[PDB]
Design a protein around this ligand. Structure first.
Ligand code: BCL
Ligand code: BCL
Ligand SMILES: CC[C@H]1c2cc3[nH]c4c(c3C)C(=O)[C@H](C(=O)OC)c4c3nc(cc4[nH]c(cc(n2)[C@@H]1C)c(C(C)=O)c4C)[C@@H](C)[C@@H]3CCC(=O)OC/C=C(\C)CCC[C@H](C)CCC[C@H](C)CCCC(C)C
Ligand SMILES: CC[C@H]1c2cc3[nH]c4c(c3C)C(=O)[C@H](C(=O)OC)c4c3nc(cc4[nH]c(cc(n2)[C@@H]1C)c(C(C)=O)c4C)[C@@H](C)[C@@H]3CCC(=O)OC/C=C(\C)CCC[C@H](C)CCC[C@H](C)CCCC(C)C
Ligand SMILES: COC1=C(OC)C(=O)C(C/C=C(\C)CC/C=C(\C)CC/C=C(\C)CC/C=C(\C)CC/C=C(\C)CC/C=C(\C)CC/C=C(\C)CC/C=C(\C)CC/C=C(\C)CCC=C(C)C)=C(C)C1=O
Ligand SMILES: CCCCCC/C=C\CCCCCCCCCC(=O)O[C@H](COC(=O)CCCCCCCCCCCCCCC)COP(=O)(O)OC[C@@H](O)CO
Ligand SMILES: CCCCCC/C=C\CCCCCCCCCC(=O)O[C@H](COC(=O)CCCCCCCCCCCCCCC)COP(=O)(O)OC[C@@H](O)CO
Ligand SMILES: CCCCCC/C=C\CCCCCCCCCC(=O)O[C@H](COC(=O)CCCCCCCCCCCCCCC)COP(=O)(O)OC[C@@H](O)CO
Ligand SMILES: CC(C)=CCC/C(C)=C/C=C/C(C)=C/C=C/C(C)=C/C=C/C=C(C)/C=C/C=C(\C)CC/C=C(\C)CCC=C(C)C
Ligand SMILES: CC(C)=CCC/C(C)=C/C=C/C(C)=C/C=C/C(C)=C/C=C\C=C(C)\C=C\C=C(/C)CC/C=C(\C)CCC=C(C)C
Ligand SMILES: CCCCCCCCCCCCO[C@@H]1O[C@H](CO)[C@@H](O[C@H]2O[C@H](CO)[C@@H](O)[C@H](O)[C@H]2O)[C@H](O)[C@H]1O
Ligand SMILES: CCCCCCCCCCCCO[C@@H]1O[C@H](CO)[C@@H](O[C@H]2O[C@H](CO)[C@@H](O)[C@H](O)[C@H]2O)[C@H](O)[C@H]1O
Ligand SMILES: [Fe+3]
Lengths: 42, 281, 250, 54, 306, 54, 42, 53, 54, 43, 54, 43, 54, 44
């Protein structure tokens, strides 16, 4: 494509980016659960 | 005168009015139809200012003041001792300025160059006419114009500004001040850069425009260029004068209150109008 | 220190203002003398030195070392305007115009004047030619605006005089300086960008009529323009504004 | 569905990552400051009231 | 119509210019940024490369900390509310200590200490940038005209923030860090000292600011008017005078009886610009220390009626 | 209906994606702020009144 | 005719875009149902 | 018919961009005007109906 | 997670470390200053009141 | 992906040392937060 | 840990040392100024009140 | 990697000297902080 | 350490010496100015009060 | 290379010796000045 990346390069890059995204979201989910138990907003 | 290269440039033509009737030079000056008009208007104005000084009773140059008519006269004529001399001097000044611009147009045509200089002078003439003609006529009285005195026109500036509280809060005034400040900064930088390129450390060769571009790229990361700086200067000066004329033409005609109160429209926007805290909460 | 005066009403503010007046007199003297490094001493209309030289003496000479082995310039110095000027005075009295004794565009007088500059190309900071044809310039291309290459060129007589074949770009500043225009006879001329108006379907040159395009001075090398050639071309084109007036709006 | 990996074929990873980091940090800072300015969710003031620290 | 040479008709792009080497440390010069067509319509399109050295690092960190201190004070003043921050952004202010603290450093953080911290950051940033303007010209073999023209503005800045407050014996005399608040400070400065119109050096500063606008409108218009003869190449016209310089000189000689050179016009320019702040610093330094009422002073000096 | 893919033959993917992301974010922020402004849908004040946190 | 994308490339790109749009719409629909059960606006 | 000749004068990219901007602005305007009138302010109608305020 | 290292094949380590250091320092200073402006968490005033200093 | 002329093994080495620094910083921050929480809990 | 020295592989020593000195100097001055701002830690005022000076 | 052109031994020696400087600075800072805490504890 | 002498093999002596001169001059002026601005450490005022000179 | 500035190891060591002599002189004078001021008017 425009970036010139190969297909396997896109596979690996998206795999790593998604792993980071899932780690960030898991931490965010735990934080939101802790806040909601501490002081719910609903 | 004559400069060593002047002789080949002194040719007939380039005159809007008069043909060869006034196509000559007095010393270095070029005279034309508008040169003769400029001389007459300037001489009459200066002589009438001296006569106004005689009537006023002072010969101190810093105390001489020619005052416009009172507000009671409206836009009509006033006695020469009260405001008539001011009106005649204002007509003479307008004639002198416009004839100066047209003489510059004639000189531009004779030299085969652009008309950027008369066009840029027309901006100053328009600001002057805003202060003496357009704003007083809109307001309804010649007495809203400023007097012709070295320190009394500063009194006019102070009184007009404080009619509306602190005049700093006029927004077009803010823009014009920003343009004036940026113009002075750019003039300093441009003079300094050209002089530093042309006058290097002693014993070194003249520097090129490449060095100028390199120096401001090293300093601020951007260089506008040799053409860009002169375009920028023209636009900065003309924008400052344009926004000055605008801030004065809106003042007392569509805005009549303290300019500080104008900014409450942003504070009183509905979504943050009533949020507690800060300065206005 | 408020109200403390040495004499009369003379305090530090008065001392400062009078000191500044002295300084400003000195500075204005210096500034006026710094600007007498070209065109002085003044001379009469026959070239002899003038009786009146003004109130400021000539400044002590200064020397520029030129960047690329181009020599050394001393100003103020002897003047170089020795080319013949085809002008005859229209009056015995001083201060009257000198009329051309031929074709002012060809003789380079009046608004069509040019100065005998160096017959060498202007160089950038690296010693290469400053102005180069775009096709000769490596990597240069049109990035915005209408591309004038290929457009027909119209004179002030509303007639086509040629077509644009190249752009002469200024390599360091990265700006277009000249348009190369091919004429009917297949030769080409350079026209400054400041003197042309690029439109949607044509390039309009208000200074010159269609018959005055062949009279534009030609450059020696097809890929190189000198300061002298640039000066001649620009002077011709700008003198067209006044000496091609009888051929306008046709 | 599982073909999102082509997004990096079109978009430069450098610009995408820098922009995403800036956006995420700014959004988090704005949310935190909104909560801090809210008297009912200012955790420092809540703890101060809870523990009688003023 | 007629091309007035204010906006380019055609933009041409080539390889980015990396600048001259001379005696510049090339390792401290960054890479070239992108090309801006919007900027290229008016001047040069190329952005960068920039030089970042020791003084550059010091200046950037100091100025960044100055901005950060002011901004975090503004955020505290808003109650950490972004909407209030946007509503009152021009109304926030970091004020100097109160006058009862004099020149001491004992003022509290919310009552003058934070202003002192920000002022130290600004001091370091501005003087580092001055040293940077000197050294960048030294590296290229250029004269130091930019450094000494910047010193003229630094003079007024020092008088406003450092010298006059010290001579007046309190930090409260200094300028607050805010948009509307420094305008309020300016107005109150004029009101407290009589009328600053009647300060002769305020008048000189105004004359030189007006003359800067005058002169640089004249110069820009003149160079654009002779740009058809390559007049914007002013260094080459200094080295080898062409018909552009001659026509520019003759226009002004025929108009107002005297002219300049392609070099000396920039001497006029640099001096007219620096004299603004040069006279302004003296005018501010004489206010309160020598003259407390400028209108009465002008009355005693023939400037106002008695 | 079965030919919308040809939009991509006329519009560059980078510009389309950037524009759509910016538009989506701005629309979401506008709707969230509108809900926050109305006292009947401001969830922070709703919870504060529900749980008596002020 | 400007991007130069082929028929197969355009179809693939639109298929991935549609997958993303349906995922976004499904998440938004679930969120809207949650809000409506919490506080209906009709 | 024969309206397809409109794709002989204007660039389709510009046409689509302009039409999208137009439609979004029109929809935003109409929704905001509906929110302006209390008669069709569904948030306020819901607040009044359920006694939320 | 065991493959994050190739982020260094995308981003310049020098740029990343410079930006990260600046960001971390500014965040730490912001948090410390927010704590100072909080009456219940200004450790200097807490110790002044505790030890009867000012 | 070769965007910076950096080999795979060099990336592994640089990431290893960067993460060593990151975990030292995080451990110090955890101890500091624990000390502050014991001194004055914020929940 | 026992591999840190390779900062000097990727970072020029002069730049690192200059930046570190700038940072340390600015931080130290800021902390001293904050201490002088607090009445309970202004050592000059503390000694003035301790020894009954002006 | 390498950008500034330092060998392994050169980097190790430079790191050793920098670490010595850091330890002297930190030791002086620790002594100063202990002295201030004895003079006026901030906890 | 006993090997600090190689700091001169990294940094230009002229620049280091100029930086130290400027830094020391400004630090000394700053400290003297703070002491003068402190009424309890202004030695001219202390001597005026001690010797009854005003 | 052995350095950036262009100083031999011996040049650098000699320059460092002279620098430390100057630094110790300045620090001794400063220590005496601080001792005198503390005796005259202590700040602790
Ligand atoms: C612009 C909006 C304001 C205004 C507010 C200010 C303020 C505020 C100040 C001045 C100041 C000046 N103004 Mg004013 N001024 C106004 C309009 C004018 C007009 C006009 C025709 O419009 C002129 C002639 C001037 C002229 C003056 C000079 C007395 C002085 C220097 C300006 C300068 O050098 O500019 C740049 C131009 C040059 C450098 C070229 C040289 C200009 C020369 C010196 C003009 C001299 C004029 C002469 C005394 C009178 C002309 C006719 C005589 C019979 C020959 N003012 C109006 C109403 N002006 C300052 C001052 O010190 O006054 C005491 C000052 O502080
Ligand atoms: C009621 C309002 C008062 C008044 C009170 C003041 C006060 C107070 C002062 C002036 C001064 C000035 N006034 Mg006044 N002034 C009045 C009315 C006027 C009128 C008018 C027509 O009415 C005019 C045109 C002026 C015009 C001026 C200028 C001539 C002069 C400002 C020079 C300048 O450029 O400073 C701008 C330049 C600086 C302040 C220096 C900047 C240099 C520093 C280093 C910048 C650093 C930048 C920083 C690091 C930020 C970096 C950001 C990033 C780079 C983005 N005054 C009246 C009567 N005026 C000033 C002066 O000096 O005159 C004596 C001044 O102190
Ligand atoms: C628009 C951008 C800026 C600008 C531009 C500009 N000015 C220009 C030009 C340009 C491009 C010229 O070409 C022209 C010129 O030739 O300059 C040398 C000029 C000029 N701008 C001048 C002055 C000037 N410009 C000013 C401002 C500005 N000029 C703007 C900031 C000011 C201010 C701010 O005060 C002044 C004083 C002159 C030096 C010159 C025009 C000379 C002229 O008009 O000559 C013919 C007239 C006379 C010889 C004098 C006539 C006198 C009257 C008959 C009586 C007095 C009337 C006057 C109103 C009294 C004032 C009393 C008190 C207010 C002091
Ligand atoms: C002769 C008097 C006039 C004058 C002259 C003048 N000014 C000058 C000069 C000169 C000759 C310079 O050489 C100098 C200069 O550099 O010009 C370009 C300068 C200068 N005049 C300036 C401003 C200025 N001049 C003014 C006025 C004037 N200057 C007078 C009219 C004013 C006014 C009217 O108020 C201002 C505001 C600056 C543009 C510049 C000096 C800049 C400077 O010292 O900067 C220091 C930096 C700070 C204190 C703030 C930094 C804020 C940043 C947010 C820092 C952090 C950045 C961040 C790390 C970036 C990260 C990027 C990555 C994440 C991608
Ligand atoms: C790079 O290029 C450039 C040059 O150099 C090639 C230049 O020189 C200049 C010009 C700039 C300067 C010389 C700098 C100095 C200029 C200023 C500081 C501007 C302020 C000027 C003045 C205060 C001078 C004012 C003088 C005037 C107004 C002329 C006086 C006019 C008369 C007395 C009347 C004239 C009318 C006549 C003679 C008509 C005659 C009729 C009868 C006699 C009847 C510029 C801009 C330039 O960019
Ligand atoms: C920074 C500067 C700021 C403010 C200063 C502004 C005033 C500048 C005045 C310059 C005057 C010197 C010009 C001059 O002296 O020019 C002479 C004639 O000037 C003439 O008619 C006209 C003389 C000028 C009249 C100016 C009146 C005011 C001619 O000289 P030469 O015969 O060529 O030798
Ligand atoms: C420095 C202070 C920045 C703080 C922001 C903190 C969050 C940053 C998140 C970054 C996540 C990726 C890590 C990274 O990328 O580290 C750095 C991120 O820098 C950048 O945030 C540069 C960002 C520029 C603006 C910084 C301020 C953003 C917030 C205010 C915006 C208004 C380095 O980036 P580069 O390789 O130089 O980018 C090169 C560009 O050409 C890409 O288009
Ligand atoms: C209708 C228009 C008026 C009539 C025509 C006038 C035409 C020409 C007259 C020009 C008058 C100039 C007067 C200059 C006075 C210089 C002396 C001086 O420096 O005056 C000082 C104050 O003036 C000052 O600010 C003077 C400074 C003013 C502010 C700066 C303006 C600079 C303008 C040019 C800049 C270049 C104080 O000094 P004293 O010892 O109290 O003097 C006493 C006498 O004034 C009589 O009482
Ligand atoms: C080349 C190879 C093989 C490998 C390279 C190595 C690589 C790539 C390493 C990188 C690994 C890492 C750390 C990746 C990290 C990824 C992360 C954190 C992704 C996070 C994504 C988060 C997202 C979308 C969040 C979106 C949120 C949105 C819209 C919210 C919108 C909110 C609104 C509208 C506010 C509404 C509320 C109010 C206004 C009050
Ligand atoms: C969103 C985020 C995160 C951030 C937002 C950041 C924001 C909003 C920033 C707003 C910044 C603003 C408004 C700034 C406005 C500034 C203005 C007008 C300034 C005007 C004039 C200032 C002047 C003369 C200052 C002069 C100071 C000088 C000579 C020197 C002072 C030196 C001192 C006093 C040193 C004292 C200390 C020691 C001796 C140790
Ligand atoms: C760079 C050079 C540095 C050194 C500069 C030295 C400049 C010295 C200039 C001295 C000029 C003195 O100028 C003269 O001063 C006296 C001081 O009262 C002024 O004052 C005089 O007149 C006024 C007005 O009538 C009276 O109110 C006043 O009582 C009387 O003393 C004069 O009006 C002025 O003409
Ligand atoms: C260039 C900087 C160094 C030289 C500075 C010269 C002036 C320094 C200060 C001079 C005296 C200041 O005056 C001091 O201010 C404090 C402020 O709390 C006041 O304290 C009461 C006193 O009036 C006095 O002790
Ligand atoms: Fe110029």
């Amino acid at each position: 494509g425009y970036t010139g990346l190969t297909d396997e390069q896109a596979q690996e890059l998206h795999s790593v980016y998604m792993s980071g995204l899932w780690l960030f979201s898991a931490v965010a989910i735990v934080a939101h659960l802790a806040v909601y138990i501490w002081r719910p907003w609903f | 005168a004559l400069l060593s290269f002047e002789q080949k440039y002194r040719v007939p033509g380039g005159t809007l009015v008069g043909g060869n009737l006034f196509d000559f030079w007095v010393g270095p000056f070029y005279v034309g139809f508008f040169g003769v008009a400029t001389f007459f208007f300037a001489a009459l104005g200066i002589i009438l200012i001296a006569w106004s000084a005689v009537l006023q009773g002072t010969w101190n140059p810093q105390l001489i003041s020619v005052y416009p008519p009172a507000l009671e006269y409206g836009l009509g004529g006033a006695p020469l001792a009260k405001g008539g001399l001011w009106q005649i001097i204002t007509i003479c000044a307008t004639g002198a300025f416009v004839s100066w611009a047209l003489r510059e147009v004639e000189i531009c045509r004779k030299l085969g160059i652009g008309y950027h200089i008369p066009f840029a002078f027309a901006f100053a003439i328009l600001a002057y006419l805003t202060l003496v003609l357009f704003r007083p006529v809109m307001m309804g009285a010649w007495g809203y114009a400023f007097p012709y005195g070295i320190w009394t026109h500063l009194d006019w500036v102070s009184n007009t500004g404080y009619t509306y509280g602190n005049f700093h809060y006029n927004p077009a005034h803010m823009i014009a001040i920003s343009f004036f400040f940026t113009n002075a900064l750019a003039l300093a930088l441009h003079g300094a850069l050209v002089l530093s390129a042309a006058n290097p450390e002693k014993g070194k060769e003249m520097r090129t425009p490449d060095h100028e571009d390199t120096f401001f790229r090293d300093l601020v990361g951007y260089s506008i260029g040799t053409l860009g700086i002169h375009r920028l200067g023209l636009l900065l000066s003309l924008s400052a004068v344009f926004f000055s004329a605008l801030c004065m033409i809106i003042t007392g005609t569509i805005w009549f209150d303290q300019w500080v109160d104008w900014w409450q429209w942003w504070v009183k926007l509905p979504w943050w109008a009533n949020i507690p805290g800060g300065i206005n909460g | 220190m408020v109200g403390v005066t040495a004499f009369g009403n003379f305090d530090l503010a008065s001392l400062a203002i009078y000191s500044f007046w002295i300084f400003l007199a000195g500075l204005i003297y210096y500034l006026q003398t710094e600007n007498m490094r070209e065109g002085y001493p003044l001379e009469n209309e026959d070239g002899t030195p003038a009786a009146n030289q003004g109130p400021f003496p000539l400044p002590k000479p200064k020397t520029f070392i030129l960047p690329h082995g181009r020599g050394t310039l001393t100003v103020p110095g002897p003047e170089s305007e020795d080319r013949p000027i085809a002008l005859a005075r229209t009056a015995v009295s001083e201060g009257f115009p000198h009329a051309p004794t031929g074709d002012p565009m060809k003789d380079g007088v009046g608004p069509a004047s040019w100065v005998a500059r160096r017959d060498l190309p202007e160089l950038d900071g690296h010693g290469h030619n400053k102005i180069k044809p775009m096709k000769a310039a490596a990597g240069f291309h049109v990035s915005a605006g209408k591309n004038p290459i290929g457009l027909p060129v119209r004179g002030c007589d509303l007639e086509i005089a040629g077509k644009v074949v190249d752009i002469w770009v200024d390599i360091p500043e990265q700006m277009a300086r000249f348009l190369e225009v091919e004429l009917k006879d297949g030769s080409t001329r350079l026209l400054p960008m400041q003197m042309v108006k690029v439109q949607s379907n044509r390039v309009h040159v208000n200074a010159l009529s269609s018959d005055l395009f062949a009279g534009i001075p030609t450059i020696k090398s097809p890929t190189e323009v000198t300061l002298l050639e640039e000066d001649k071309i620009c002077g011709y084109v700008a003198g067209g504004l006044m000496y091609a007036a009888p051929k306008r709006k046709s | 569905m599982s073909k999102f990996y082509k997004i990096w074929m079109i978009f430069d990873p450098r610009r995408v990552f820098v922009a995403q980091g800036v956006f995420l940090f700014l959004l988090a800072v704005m949310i935190h400051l909104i909560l801090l300015s809210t008297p009912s969710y200012n955790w420092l003031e809540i703890s101060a009231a809870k523990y009688n620290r003023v | 119509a007629e091309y007035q040479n204010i906006f380019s008709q055609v933009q041409v792009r080539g390889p980015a210019d990396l600048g001259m080497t001379e005696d510049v440390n090339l390792a401290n010069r960054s890479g070239v940024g992108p090309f801006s067509t919007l900027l290229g319509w008016f001047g040069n399109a190329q952005l960068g490369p920039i030089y970042l050295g020791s003084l550059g690092v010091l200046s950037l960190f100091s100025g960044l900390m100055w901005f950060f201190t002011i901004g975090i004070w503004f955020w505290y003043q808003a109650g950490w509310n972004p909407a209030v921050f946007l509503r009152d952004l021009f109304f926030f202010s970091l004020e100097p200590p109160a006058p009862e603290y004099g020149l001491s450093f004992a003022a509290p953080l919310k009552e003058g200490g934070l202003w002192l911290i920000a002022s130290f950051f600004m001091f370091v940033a501005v003087w580092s940038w001055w040293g940077r303007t000197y050294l960048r010209a030294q590296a290229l073999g250029m004269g130091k005209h930019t450094a000494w023209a910047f010193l003229s503005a630094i003079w007024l800045w020092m008088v406003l923030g450092f010298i006059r407050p010290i001579l007046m014996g309190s930090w409260s005399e200094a300028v607050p860090y805010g948009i509307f608040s420094h305008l309020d400070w300016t107005n109150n400065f004029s009101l407290v000292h009589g009328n600053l119109f009647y300060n002769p050096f305020h008048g000189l500063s105004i004359a030189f600011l007006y003359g800067s606008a005058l002169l640089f409108a004249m110069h820009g218009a003149t160079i654009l008017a002779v740009s058809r003869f390559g007049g914007e190449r002013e260094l080459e016209q200094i080295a080898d005078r062409g018909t552009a310089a001659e026509r520019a000189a003759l226009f002004w000689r025929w108009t107002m009886g005297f002219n300049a050179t392609m070099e000396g016009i920039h001497r006029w320019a640099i001096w007219m610009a620096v004299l603004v702040t040069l006279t302004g610093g003296i005018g501010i330094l004489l206010s309160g220390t020598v003259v407390d009422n400028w209108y009465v002073w002008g009355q005693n000096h023939g400037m106002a009626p008695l």
